[PDB]
Amino acid sequence: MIYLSRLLIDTGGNPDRPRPGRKWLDNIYNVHRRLSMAFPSGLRREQDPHFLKPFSPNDFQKTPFLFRVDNNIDGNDKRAIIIVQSVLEPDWDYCFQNALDFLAAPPETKEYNPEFKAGQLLRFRLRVNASVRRHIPEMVQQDGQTIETGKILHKRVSLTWDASSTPDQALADWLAAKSPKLGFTLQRCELLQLGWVYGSKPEPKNVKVKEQGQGYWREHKYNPLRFRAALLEGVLEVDDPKLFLKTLSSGIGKAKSFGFGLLSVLPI
Amino acid sequence: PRFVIRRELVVGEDVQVSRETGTSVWRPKGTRADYNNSEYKKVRAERL
């Protein structure tokens, strides 16, 4: 089965007070990690039920989940919504048992068994990673004069349109170039919000050999993480059954570990 | 019975004065670890 969840964050009120939940959302590595401890090891939940031990990546089960973050829900209060889709049952009472100030409402979970027929009108919302891998020459220095070096870089850059086409048309072309393999066809697709996402990540680096030996002394060094994001909403029609279900809970684009593929489907 | 005389010796010219060669007071250990020492920053970084 498929499991969907919702988390609510205030993100508002008095700006003069500490707001740890508001601070948690500025980094996407932290958001992904915080969703990632929501699944302990059969042994871990018997070892520390209080979640008061050092966190290591190896004592938690591995599952390729997908998530998206949304905003602007009114009702005289501001809210931030995290929607998590996974193939195992999340344990929301273990991830946030010492972090209740993050959220303005207790978490909720429900089952999801979506069964469809071919040729069905469906409403979808998706934020896509607009990236293309390209060949780039190497520019260095730029100390008032550009120095060229013959190395050609294979790097992942954003998709680029020309000067005479709208971004929505090029994004729709990029999505309809891919929709035959996933199992769907477009009729309409408009661009809502396009932008960048920054993240920072700890990475260990060696410094000095221990005098007593057995390892190093080490120091954390932090590496940037830049991605392109474009949020899209539209109406699609199904072309294959086990193929649309092959599209769901697997992803459509790249960077899925950092919340870049999630299909939210409504039968219109 | 025996015969006894008395003599005197002024210090500083034919007998020297040795140093203390030790510690008298005991006192407890050192609290107040310094937070600008290099070993502290190295251990803090490794623990992080």
From TrEMBL, chain A:
Highest taxon of the lineage: Bacteria
Enzyme Commission number, as recorded: 3.1.-.-
Keywords from the named record: Hydrolase
Class of enzymatic activity (EC top level): hydrolase
Protein's name according to its UniProt entry: CRISPR-associated endoribonuclease Cse3
Gene expressing this chain: cse3
Automatic annotation (TrEMBL), chain B:
Protein origin, superkingdom: Bacteria
Protein name in UniProt: CRISPR system Cascade subunit CasD
Originating organism: Candidatus Cloacimonetes bacterium ADurb.Bin088
